[PDB]
Curated annotation (Swiss-Prot), chain A:
Role description: Attaches the virion to the cell membrane by interacting with host receptor, initiating the infection. The major receptor is host ACE2. When S2/S2' has been cleaved, binding to the receptor triggers direct fusion at the cell membrane. When S2/S2' has not been cleaved, binding to the receptor results in internalization of the virus by endocytosis using host TFRC and GRM2 and leading to fusion of the virion membrane with the host endosomal membrane. Alternatively, may use NRP1/NRP2 and integrin as entry receptors.
Protein name, as recorded: Spike protein S1
UniProt subunit comment: Binds to host ACE2. RBD also interacts with the N-linked glycan on 'Asn-90' of ACE2. Cleavage of S generates a polybasic C-terminal sequence on S1 that binds to host Neuropilin-1 (NRP1) and Neuropilin-2 (NRP2) receptors. Interacts with host integrin alpha-5/beta-1 (ITGA5:ITGB1) and with ACE2 in complex with integrin alpha-5/beta-1 (ITGA5:ITGB1). May interact via cytoplasmic c-terminus with M protein. May interact (via N-terminus) with host bilirubin and biliverdin, thereby preventing antibody binding to the SARS-CoV-2 spike NTD via an allosteric mechanism.
Interval of the full protein contained in this chain: 535 to 582 of 1273
UniProt superkingdom: Viruses
Amino acid sequence: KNKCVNFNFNGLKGTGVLTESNKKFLPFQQFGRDIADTTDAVRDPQTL
Amino acid sequence: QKLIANQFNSAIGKIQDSLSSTPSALGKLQDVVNHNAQALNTLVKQLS
């Protein structure tokens, strides 16, 4: 966390910095999207 | 001279009040700002 890394979440490849979020996700919701519909938040496996 | 000075002062005060009470006076500058923001936001949305 808090460092520029290239991640992989169930095949979702990308590069960025990972931090905590206050996005009150619904139980069925897995990841969020921004205005441009690029992934903005994600729920990680093995930790929820 | 005194009458002209009084008329000028009253006109200046009335212009101040009219600008303070009319919202559509600054429409040209507001439209410039809105056009720039709208173009940039549309360019952002186009990525999806």
